[PDB]
Design a protein around this nucleic acid. Sequence first.
RNA 1: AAAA
RNA 2: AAAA
Lengths: 432, 432
Amino acid sequence: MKLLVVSWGDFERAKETKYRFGGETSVGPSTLPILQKVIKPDWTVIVLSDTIGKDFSSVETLREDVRNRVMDFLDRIGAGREVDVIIAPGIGEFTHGSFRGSAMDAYYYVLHALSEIIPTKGDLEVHFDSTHGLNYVTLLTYRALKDLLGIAAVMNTVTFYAYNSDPFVPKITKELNINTIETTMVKPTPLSEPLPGFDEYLCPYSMERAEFVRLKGSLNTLKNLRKEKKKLEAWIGSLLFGLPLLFLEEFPDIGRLESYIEELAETWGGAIAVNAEEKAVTRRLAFGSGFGTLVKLLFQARITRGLLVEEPYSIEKLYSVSDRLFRGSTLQRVRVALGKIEDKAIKYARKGAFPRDIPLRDFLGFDAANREVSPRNVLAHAGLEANVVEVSMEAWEPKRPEEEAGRHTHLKYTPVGLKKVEDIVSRALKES
Amino acid sequence: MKLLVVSWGDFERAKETKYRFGGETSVGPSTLPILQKVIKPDWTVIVLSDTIGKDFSSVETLREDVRNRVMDFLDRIGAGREVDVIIAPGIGEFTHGSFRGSAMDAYYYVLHALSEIIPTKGDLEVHFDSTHGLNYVTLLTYRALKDLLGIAAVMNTVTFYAYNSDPFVPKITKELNINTIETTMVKPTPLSEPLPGFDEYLCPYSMERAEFVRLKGSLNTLKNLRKEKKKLEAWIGSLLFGLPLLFLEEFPDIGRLESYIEELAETWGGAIAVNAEEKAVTRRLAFGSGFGTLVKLLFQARITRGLLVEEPYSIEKLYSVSDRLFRGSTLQRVRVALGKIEDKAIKYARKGAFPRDIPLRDFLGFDAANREVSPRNVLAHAGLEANVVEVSMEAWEPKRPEEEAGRHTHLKYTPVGLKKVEDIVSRALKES
RNA sequence: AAAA
RNA sequence: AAAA
C-alpha cells in the first residue's frame, strides 16, 4: 500500500510555476499533480490549517468552507476526488478572522485523523511532501506520522520518503526541482510511555474553573480509565519488555478504547466557541499528552489484533506471537524462557505424564521455599516467573514428543499472579 | 546546560513586528532577542542555508559573505555574539546565485556540526525555534538534533522545547505570539544502525567515474574501516542488546573515529566546485548514511567514555556499567547472569578456593553435552556465554565473602570467543 | 534447579 | 526564503 501525505498552507495564494520530478515536468500552482503522476499512490491525504476558512456562522460551516475550497482547487489543478482532507486546528490573527487555542491541538488532531486512515494491515510505503506547508503544521504532521509509522513497523515493513521543492521566489523562478530530503526503513518502536495523570487528557485553554471541574466530573472516560490504567500499562510493558503471555492476557478491549477517544475528541469539539460577529474561533479546551497516548494505544492494538487468539495459550502460540513482536536479545530471552518449560514438557510426555493445574514452580521441580515474587525474576524470564504461572498439558498419544509437547502445554497467570505481574510491569514502565 | 537552536532562511527580508513570549514583548525583525531574554540560554546556535550568499569566487568567499551578514543582523537586533553559526549546504536557483548538490547534505552537515557543539557530559535543556526557517532546512535540522539528543539521553536527562510564531501576513500583521509546539522528556535511543557498505560514505552527485573510483581508492578511512567494521558493530550491538563485557572490551578508539569523520568531511568539502563568473556552486560529492552512522557512533562513544576502565573487569564493575547503560528486562537479565557468577564465586571463596582462567562452563559446573556458541545463548545471557568467557578469582582472605566476591572476580572473553561473539552481534545488528 |  |  502506497500513501501520499502533503502539508498545505494558503494553497490558493501559490503562483503558477513548473516542477521537475522523476524525469517528468509539470505546470501549475501545486506539486500534488506531478507527485501523484510519478509516485502513483493508492491513497492521498491533504493536511492544512482551518485558518484559511471564512464562514464563521459555526464550526461545521468553517470546515465546510475550507473543504469546498480544497475540492474546488483539486478540480482546477486536475488531481481527482479520491482524497482524505485533514482540517487541523490552526492559530493566529488574520484580516478575515481570528483563531485561538493551543498550537499543539494540531499534533493531537492530525494524530487522531491519521490513526483512522493509515492501514493497520500489510506493508506501507509512505510519501510526505512539505513543499507548501506552514512551518508549525508541517513539523507537527511529520511528528504524528513518524509516531504512528514506528508502531505499524512492529508488525509490517514500513518505508518513508520525504520531498520538498526548491524555495519559490516570485519574478525569478523558472522551475522548481522536487528534492528528496529523506529515505528511511522505519524502525519498530512500540508505545513506551505510561498513561499520565487525569490532569493531562483535556486542559482548559480559556474555560473557567466551574465549567471545567463540572465537565471533567461528567466524563465516563476518566472514571473507567482510573479503573483500567494499570491493566493498559501492563499491556504496553508486554511489547516493550518481551512478555508474550501478558500481551495475550491484557490485550485491550478495542470497542472500549474507541469510546474513550470518541468522548474526549467530541468534548474538545463541543468546547470550540465560534463568534459570527467578531469572526473569532476560541478552542476553550486543549488536548493533553494523555489523548495522544490513548490514540497510539488504540493504533498499537489494531496493528497487533491479528495475533490475539482464543485461550488457552500454548508454548507454540507464545513462540509464534514472540517471533512477530520481538527482535534481538529480547526475542532470544523469550525463546530461552519458553524453551526451559518446553524441555520439561517433552520429558513428562516421553513418560506418559500430563500434569494439569500445576504451578510452574512444581512443573520445573523448584523448591517450595522460594515463593516471593521479585521484579527481577518477572522481567528477566519474559514474565513467566515460576510463582505466578500455572501449567496444564493436554493428554495425547505422543509419537514425536519433541515437536508435539509445545502446542499441548498451556500457560496462564493465576488470579493473584496476574495482579503482582501487573504491578511490577506498570511500575517498571513509569521509571522507564 | 541550556541550549538554544534557531532555524533561519532569508532573515534580512523579515519585517519589523511585535512578538509576545513568556509575558514579555519585543519589536524587531527576529524572534531571537525575546527567545534569549526569556530562556536565558548558556549557548545559541543559528542554522541557515548558504543559498543567501552573493559575491563568491570560492567556498571561503561564500561562507565569509554569509557569516558577515549574520553578524551585522545580530548587532542590529537585541542579540549578542556568544553564538555558533552553522552555514548549511542549501539548494536552488536564485537571482544572485545557483546551488546544486544533494538536498540531504544539509542533514549530514548539521548532524556533524551539532555533534561538535552539544555537550557530552551533563543534563541538557534544549530549545528549538523554527519560526524563520525554510521548510526543508527546518525538518533536516529538527531530525539531526533529535537523533543526537536520543543518544545523549542514554547517559543524561534531556528535555526539549520547540517554538513557532503565528504565520506572518505581509503589510497586515502587527503582533505575533511565539507558541509552544513541543515539550518532551527525550527517550534514551542507542545507535541501532550497522555500518553500511563502502559505496555509502561518499556518493557521486556530479563527478566523472574515473575521478570517483580514484578518490575512493585513495581514502585511508575506507581501508581502515574495512578492518574495524565488525568490531565497531560489535560495540554498537553491546549497548543495543545489553552486553556489558563486550561494551568494555570493544570500546572504540575515539582518536581514529575523529580522523575517519574529518577525512570524509574534508573530501566532501574539496569536491565542491565554485564558478565565480556564472555564480554556480556544485557539490560534486553527496554524504551517504555511513557518514551519519560514524558521527552518531563518535557521539555515543563521547557520551559513554566516562564508564571505560582498563582490564581486568570485575563482576562489581559490570553491575555499575549495566546500571548506567541498561533498563527494563535488558538490565534484569544482566543482573541474573552476573548474580549466578557471583553466587558460584562465593561458594568457591567459602571453601578457600580461588580458581583462575577457568572456562565459565566449568566454573558454573556445566557438563559436556554442547560446546557450540549459538547466537541464542550469546544474546539471551548478556553476552556471558559459557564457551566464550573465562573466570578469574584473584585470591584474598575472605571475612564477608558474599560482599567481597564481586570486587575480586574478573571476566574476559577468550581470543577465539571474542571473534565468535563479534560475528554473532554484528549479524544480529544487520538482521534487526 | 546445569543458561531460573 | 515567518501562509513554497
